[PDB]
Amino acid sequence: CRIYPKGPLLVLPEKIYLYSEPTVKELLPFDVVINVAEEANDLRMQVPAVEYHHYRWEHDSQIALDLPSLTSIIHAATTKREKILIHSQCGLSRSATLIIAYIMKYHNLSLRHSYDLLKSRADKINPSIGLIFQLMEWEVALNA
Ligand SMILES: [Mg+2]
Ligand SMILES: [Mg+2]
């Protein structure tokens, strides 16, 4: 591919977190955990006090499809003021994409401004082009 040397970085005031691949124990404080990396171990059974979601994204997935469901999981957690972790393998591309996507809908911002917001708090984010295009699709629907 430590990147996040102090653990899961709070990126949004609504207790939205961003990380690379976790260990089991690192998952514990979170109410909702969304794992958007195919190769990243499914830790579901290992943590019963956690609403665990795994979406097996690879860098060439049609992620725009998954975005209504995924951003709804997130919005529903924020109204209940729950602690939320969104992680991938390296916490650069797939997980950042999902957050940016959230920001587009529920912060009512453009792709560009949403990216700018996350890069401002997660300096190392580097969304893949394929994923950027999937986000471009997301921007269209939200504008329809
Ligand atoms: Mg692993
Ligand atoms: Mg493939």
With beta carbons less than 8 A apart as the criterion, state whether 135 and 100 touch: yes
Q: Which domain holds residue 1?
A: 1-144
- 67 Cβ contact list (under 8 Å, min separation 6): 98, 101, 138
Residue 140 Cα, ligand 1 centroid: separation in angstroms?
A: 35
CATH of the domain at 10: 3.90.190.10
| Nearest ligand (C-alpha, residue 60) | 2
Which residues lie across from 51 on neighbouring strands? 32
SS3 at position 12:
strand
| Nearest ligand (C-alpha, residue 90) | 1
Running DSSP on this structure, what letter comes out for residue 39? T
Q: How far apart are CA 38 and CA 77, in angstroms?
A: 23
Domains held by the chain: number: 1
Resolution in angstroms comes to 2.8
Residue 30 Cα, ligand 2 centroid: separation in angstroms?
A: 30
Q: How far apart are CA 85 and CA 65, in angstroms?
A: 21
| Nearest ligand (C-alpha, residue 56) | 2
Quickly tell me which residue has 């329809």 as its tokens.
144
Residue 60 Cα, ligand 2 centroid: separation in angstroms?
A: 6
Nearest to 125 by CA among 4, 35, 5, 21: 4
Running DSSP on this structure, what letter comes out for residue 110? -
Question: Which pair of structure tokens corresponds to residue 85?
Answer: 């972790």
Residue environment code for 87-98, b if the CB has 16+ CB neighbours within 10 A, otherwise e: bbbbbbbbbbbb
With beta carbons less than 8 A apart as the criterion, state whether 10 and 16 touch: yes
